[PDB]
Amino acid sequence: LETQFTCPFCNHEKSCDVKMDRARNTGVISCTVCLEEFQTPITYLSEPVDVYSDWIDACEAANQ
Amino acid sequence: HTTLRKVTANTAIYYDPNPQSTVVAEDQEWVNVYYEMPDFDVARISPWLLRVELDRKHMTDRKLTMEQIAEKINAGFGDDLNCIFNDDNAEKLVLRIRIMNMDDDVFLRCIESNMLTDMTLQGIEQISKVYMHLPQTDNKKKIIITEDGEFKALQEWILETDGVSLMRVLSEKDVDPVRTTSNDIVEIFTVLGIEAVRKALERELYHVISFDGSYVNYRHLALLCDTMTCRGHLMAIT
Amino acid sequence: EDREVLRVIFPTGDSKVVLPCNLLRMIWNAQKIFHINPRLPSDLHPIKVVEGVKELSKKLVIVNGDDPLSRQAQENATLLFNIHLRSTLCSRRMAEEFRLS
Amino acid sequence: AIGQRIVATLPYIKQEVPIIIVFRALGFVSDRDILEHIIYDFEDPEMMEMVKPSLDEAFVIQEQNVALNFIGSRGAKPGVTKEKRIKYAKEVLQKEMLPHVGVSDFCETKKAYFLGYMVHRLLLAALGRRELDDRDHYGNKR
Amino acid sequence: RKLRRQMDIIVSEVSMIRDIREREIRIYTDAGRICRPLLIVEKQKLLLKKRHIDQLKEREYNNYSWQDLVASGVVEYIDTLEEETVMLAMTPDDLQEKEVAYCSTYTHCEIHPSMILGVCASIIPFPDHNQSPRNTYQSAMGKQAMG
Amino acid sequence: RDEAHKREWNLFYQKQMQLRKGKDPKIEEFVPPDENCPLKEASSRRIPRLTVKAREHCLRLLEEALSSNRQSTRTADEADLRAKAVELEHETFRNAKVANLYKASVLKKVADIHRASKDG
Amino acid sequence: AKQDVIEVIEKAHNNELEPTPGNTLRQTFENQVNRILNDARDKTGSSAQK
Amino acid sequence: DDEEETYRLWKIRKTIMQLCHDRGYLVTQDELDQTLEEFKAQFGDKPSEGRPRRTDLTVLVAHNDDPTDQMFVFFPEEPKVGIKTIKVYCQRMQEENITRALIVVQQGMTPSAKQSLVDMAPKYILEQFLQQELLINITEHELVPEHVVMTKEEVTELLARYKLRENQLPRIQAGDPVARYFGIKRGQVVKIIRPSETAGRYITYRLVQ
Amino acid sequence: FIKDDYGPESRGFVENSYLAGLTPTEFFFHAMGGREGLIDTAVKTAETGYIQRRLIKSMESVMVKYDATVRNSINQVVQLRYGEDGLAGESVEFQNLATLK
Amino acid sequence: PGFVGIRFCQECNNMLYPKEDKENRILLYACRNCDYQQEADNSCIYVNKITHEVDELTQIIADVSQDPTLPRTEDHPCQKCGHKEAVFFQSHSARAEDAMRLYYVCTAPHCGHRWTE
Ligand SMILES: [Zn+2]
Ligand SMILES: [Zn+2]
Ligand SMILES: [Zn+2]
């Protein structure tokens, strides 16, 4: 699987890093280039793919 | 090696709100015989019961008693738990486990899992099985020289294990520390050294070669073993 | 003393060993070559046996040299064969069993 | 951890996924329905005790779309949009998982029944109620 | 089984297996299943009768062939999975009554036990009197022989 | 492996105990035995969480067991009863090292004396 | 030998067979059966030799 | 938990006495052949109660060659030995002018403690032992031949007789159980005497490396 | 056979001799037995070959020197005397020690 | 005691989990995704039979009497109907070491009596 994803805001490949704070059940995805940050709830089954997913979904929902 | 699981018939986690009255009449009577007076603190007690039933057959086979098992529980967990047991003259062997105040039921489940496997009542770890037999071949019999000056073979009991704990076994009381050996040559090297492993490797190779009745001159075996041990460590032929 | 040493070397009762010179067959060959009659007394002085065995033992060397290291190594290298030789070429055996001249 | 968890490995998924998640993704959310598809005699408690760890592993993913979100998440190629991912997962389940059962829509019940049968066979093997299959048996060859 | 023996809807190649201990019936029409013909046994009797042998003796004239045996439900093709559920008599002598019956519930009988051998091993005379590796060696040397 | 799981299990355990234990240990001061205590070494604190009153109750049970044995066998002397009970209690305290094990041992002794009395 | 093996089987079927130390019931039964058959083979071989 | 501990301590003491005697230190025959009853008499019987205490089992012996060469054998009560206790032992060795010591640990010793052990090596030679290792004397096993430490003059004579360099001899590791038992360091040569089924006797030499 | 038949015939006891001839079931069981040995040969060949090559490569340059020591190519002493007795293996014989027992 | 089965919530058909009433000290079975609750009566939330003394007669099914590959005997009649013929077989199941024990099934149709000797 992939842990570094392309940022939906600046389109920089592999510029997004994902941090899984399991103790607080929160995943934080941050772009290194444009410094955009997003926080989502996560479960023990969650992965950086699902944090990256929740971010894309939040973007598309907010852009409606 | 003997864990608790090897001597238990079954387990069960009940919900006994008060030890004064339990869910089984036998257990209630025995406990209230035990619960005559406050030998404890009532506040620091949980209602979650963990009842363990042992096999009289296995315990007798190992000459184990619920006192030793309870002492092992105390050693491995401490006074933070509460283990009580009935007399051995009862119909069944039973012991009850509680905790002094994750959930308590899930915690009891975790304790029961660990108690069955990790906790050891008897024996040495890594030794899974032991066979006891009287040898009929002179290679394992005790050979002595009588006062008349003759070689005499005495039949004696010897034990054969499935694992190897050579250092621990050698230190056990009534175990011969001169003859007790292993077929695992790396353990021999670790415990006894390089000359010992030289000799043991020679013996194992001789056993393998001569099992068929075939014979190879000693100097070839000696040269191989010397080649494998001359540098102070075990040199594999690889 | 050789017997005690052997008891140490072979703590079991296994007397079967692998050694260079088949002494029993050599004694049998000597008996046949020189037409030894076992039923008559021999002319072999028992002291001749002891001295002869000593010289022979001196004559077969695996580690040569006169220093103490060489002497001990030579003693060790031929210890088993020398025990066998002394227990086969005894004066008692030579006199009452092999009857060599 | 404590119990024995059952995990299914699907084609085009590089990580194992709990079986209950697969059943939920097929459209069976309630534990009762999944157990009915897996266990046919509810009076058998031992089988029920043997399946509890699988339910415990997947108790937060109580919705079909979340399960299809999960499976799509475990996939080799990660689509940026969830909609493509749930659809990709829906594609994998409908087309790549158990094709001989069916490859058309509205076949999720047949897939669920066959997966439940597979889990039932696994449970029977685990409980020692059925002998393991022999790979050299010529009836298992073509 | 009746349908397959009559060849109405189920062709002879089809395998039907009932696992009684389990509660499964498995039917296979796939390709690649190895099967062999066997004689069907009723209560304790072969369905193959003297009349079938008489008809086969004149197969040149009456056009009575092996296919007619299969059509009359006297012989059956059995694959390995179905063989797992068959009670097989080695010879019709096994169907005779004994002071102590062994099976008494035979479903099939072998046509002849020598059919277990292949082409090369079928030319060995008295192969049941040899050590098996020698039969194996002949199975290759026969392929190396000159003719 | 097993060693890694044993330490991890211990880590899981101690924190659960801490959750299940008080911030500070409400040490109930050891009750000093009355001068009339017939229990040998009544002032000892060798066995943790064991009260002198529990020892007195156990000695009372031993007294009852010895009385039953005497009446069944018609023992003559009476002073031996108290001395024997005190000696049994002291031996049990000396041997055992945990309260529950101590009580179980005393009950086992009581059962043994009861069986001996039954035998006659 | 065949009758002896039948007797051993009948004993095992009625739970009148006890496992030898270090062996489960099945291993004990197989040991007895193989002992009987090996003894029969040895006896027949000796007769043929004679 | 008490009688077993007493037996363990007695066995460790017996093995230590045998080791000291084999290393050339002065030990009395009674000390070597001390029964368990004599151990319970001279020492305590209830290690849980503190009698005997491990600090009461410390032994001091002097070499036969010269009294000034002395060796300590203390048994720390702490199951695991750290740098601090090593420093205490080093300080008392300084005070008493003792340059050698044996330390018998129950559970083990910390890596930094081992680094300290090797750090002050040239000045003080203090070695480590697990009591599990000392519960039996490995030199008495039938598989272990007789090991004899050679003097420098003997090594020179050997190398001159066989015209060898040190690196041409067979090797024994300094961490070898027998090498640790005899306390031999790198550069020393041990002479091994073993019986042979072909020659009767055979002497081989191993260099410590 | 019937299910759970543990009798000699069921489990592969051939009660016939080669002259009498085997019954079909005995024939098949005997074929299974022989197949076992054929397979064993076919696999042991390669296993043993690799072992042999490794042994040879491990001891190829060890030889007796003119000082009678055994040394490897690096001139390290492997044995101070070959076989601990300094003898070749083709000239020794089995003999019995007369004073051991 | 025996095995303790699982319960399902009446409102959402999900597995119920044991819980206690801190104020009342009684055992309850409460759902997780929902808030449904139920009063227990067994008071035994877990069981683990190490010896595995399970009844193999329960698992046997009477249909096995139709298997032509099973042996049949006329020396162990059944009591339910008195039929003299029966099939017999072994446990052939893991967790059964002394599994050479025979089990019998009556061959009379519509009787299906299983028993052991
Ligand atoms: Zn960005
Ligand atoms: Zn619910
Ligand atoms: Zn009936």
The structural domains of chain H, ordered by start, are 1-136 (3.40.1340.10), 137-209 (3.90.940.20)
CA-nearest of I65, C62, I87, I59 to H164 is I65
Helix E132-141 crosses helix I24-59 at what angle (to 10 degrees)?
A: 80
What technique solved it? cryo-EM
J43 CB neighbours in chain B (<8 A) are 14-16, 23
Nearest to J102 among G13, G24, G26 (CB): G13
Cα D9–Cα D12–Cα D14 angle in degrees, nearest 5: 60
Structure tokens at B131: 């066979």
Identity of the residue numbered B47: P
Give me the phi and psi of I71, to 5 degrees please: -135, 155
Please indicate if the annotation marks J44 as binding a ligand. no
Give the nearest chain B residue to J18 (CA atoms). Answer: B105
Rounded Cα distance between B94 and B99, Å, is 17
Q: Do chains D and J touch (3 or more CB pairs under 8 A)?
A: yes
DSSP C6-73: HHHH-SSS--EEEESS-HHHHHHHHHHHTT--TTS-----HHHHHHHHHHHHHH--SS--SSHHHHHH
SS3 percent helix, strand, coil of chain A, rounded to 5, is 25, 30, 50
Rounded CA-CA distance J13/J29 in Å is 13
Q: Do F100 and B89 touch (CB under 8 A)?
A: no
Q: How far apart are CA B235 and CA I39, in angstroms?
A: 33
Residues F91 and F100: their CA atoms lie apart, in Å, by: 16
- Phi and psi dihedrals of C15, rounded to 5? -90, -5
Q: Which of H15, H23, H7 is nearest to H138 (CA)?
A: H15
Residues 21-80 on B with a CB inside 8 Å of I are none
Q: How many CA atoms lie within 13 A of B80 on its CB side?
A: 17
**Which residues are B96's β-sheet partners?**
B51, B84
Q: Write out the E strands in chain B.
A: 2-3, 8-15, 48-54, 81-85, 93-99, 120-122, 130-133, 142-145, 151-154, 158-161
- The full set of domains in chain D, from first to last, is 1-142 (3.90.1110.10)
Task: Supply the angle between the helices B104-117 and F2-20 in degrees, to the nearest 10.
Answer: 150
Q: Measure the CA–CA gap between E128 and E122, rounded to whole angstroms.
A: 11
Taking an 8 Å cut-off on Cβ atoms, the answer to whether A53 and D73 are in contact is yes
Instruction: Identify each DSSP E strand in H86-188 by its residue range.
Output: 100-105, 108-109, 125-130, 146-149, 171-172
Burial label for A32, CB within 10 Å (0-12, 13-18, 19+), is middle
Angstrom distance (rounded) from CA D19 to CA D25: 10
What Cα–Cα distance (Å) separates residue E70 from each residue in B64, E12, E38? 70, 8, 10
Among chain D residues, the shortest Cα distance to A45 is held by D70
- Which residues in chain J touch residue E107, judged by CB atoms under 8 angstroms apart? 68
For H79, phi and psi rounded to 5 degrees?
-60, -30
Computed on alpha carbons and rounded to an integer, the radius of gyration of chain A in Å comes to 11
Candidates I77, I84, I87; nearest CB to H164: I77
Write down which chains contact chain C via at least 3 CB pairs under 8 A.
Answer: B, H, I
Length of chain I: 101
Find, in chain H, the residue whose alpha carbon is nearest to that of B218.
Answer: H198
Q: Phi first, then psi: what are they for J114, rounded to 5°? A: -105, 140
Other Cβ atoms within 10 Å of E143 Cβ, number: 9
Q: What distance in Å separates the CA atoms of residue H69 and residue H62, rounded to the nearest whole number?
A: 6
Q: What is the nearest CA distance from B13 to chain D, expressed in angstroms?
A: 14
- The three-class DSSP label of residue J3 is coil
CA D62/CA H160 separation, integer angstroms: 86
The annotation status of J12 as a binding-site residue, yes or no, is yes
Secondary structure element (H or E) that encloses residue I67, with its range: none
Ligand 1 centre to CA of A57 (Å) is 16
Q: Copy the structure tokens of residue F105.
A: 């041992």
Do residues B175 and B152 lie in contact, with contact meaning Cβ atoms separated by under 8 Å?
no
How many Å lie between the centroid of ligand 1 and the Cα of residue J82? 85
Non-local (6+) Cβ contacts of H170 within 8 A are B226, B229, B230, B231, B232, H204, H205, H206, H207, I76, I77, I78
Residue numbers in the known binding site of A for Zn(2+) are: 7, 10, 31, 34
Alpha-carbon Rg for chain F, nearest whole angstrom, is 20
CB contact under 8 A, A45 and D76: no
Omega before B135 within 30 of 0, i.e. cis: no
Resolution, expressed in angstroms to one decimal: 3.5
Element (H or E) spanning D12, and its range?
Answer: none
Alpha carbon dihedral D46, D52, D54, D56, in 10-degree steps, equals -170
Helix, strand, coil fractions of chain I, as percent rounded to 5:
40, 10, 50
Q: How far apart are CA B188 and CA B166, in angstroms?
A: 8
Q: Please give the structure tokens belonging to residue B142.
A: 């005790």
The answer to whether residues H12 and H130 touch, using CB atoms and an 8 Å cutoff, is: no
Read off the CATH number of the domain in which B96 is found: 3.30.1360.140
Q: Of B215, B197, B198, which Cα lies nearest the Cα of B206? A: B215
Say whether residue C77 is in contact with chain H using an 8 A CB cutoff. yes
Query: What is the set of domains in chain J, with CATH numbers?
Result: 4-48 (no CATH), 49-117 (2.20.25.10)
Burial I18-42 (b: 16+ CB within 10 A, else e): eeeebbbebbebbbeeeeeeeeeee
Strand A26-31 and strand E35-40: the pairing is: unpaired
Three-class SS state of D103:
coil
For tokens 């390290």, the residue is: I76
What distance in Å separates residue D8's CA from the closest CA in chain J?
Answer: 22
Region class of E126: left (phi > 0), else alpha (psi between -120 and 50), else beta: left
**Tokens, residue H160:** 């001159």
Paired with B158 in beta bridges are B133
Task: Convert B155-212 into a string of H (helix), E (strand) and C (coil).
Answer: CCCEEEECCCCHHHHHCCCCCCCCCCCCCCHHHHHHHHCHHHHHHHHHHHHHHHHHCC
Contact J100, J85 (CB under 8 A): no
Strand H200-208 versus strand H171-172 pairing type: parallel
Instruction: Look at phi and psi of residue H32 and say left if phi exceeds 0, alpha if psi is from -120 to 50, else beta.
Output: alpha
Spell out where chain F is interrupted, by the residue before each break (C to N > 2.5 A).
Answer: none
H or E element at residue F119: helix F99-119
What is the extent of the structural domain holding B79?
Answer: 1-122
Chains with ≥3 CB–CB distances under 8 Å to D: A, B, E, J
E60's torsion region: left (phi>0), alpha (psi -120 to 50) or beta? alpha
- Cα(D67)–Cα(D54) distance, integer angstroms: 14
Measure Cα distances from B183 to B170, B194, B210, B228 in Å: 14, 15, 16, 17
Answer yes or no: is J34 a known binding residue: yes
- CA atoms of E88 and H127, how far apart (whole Å): 78
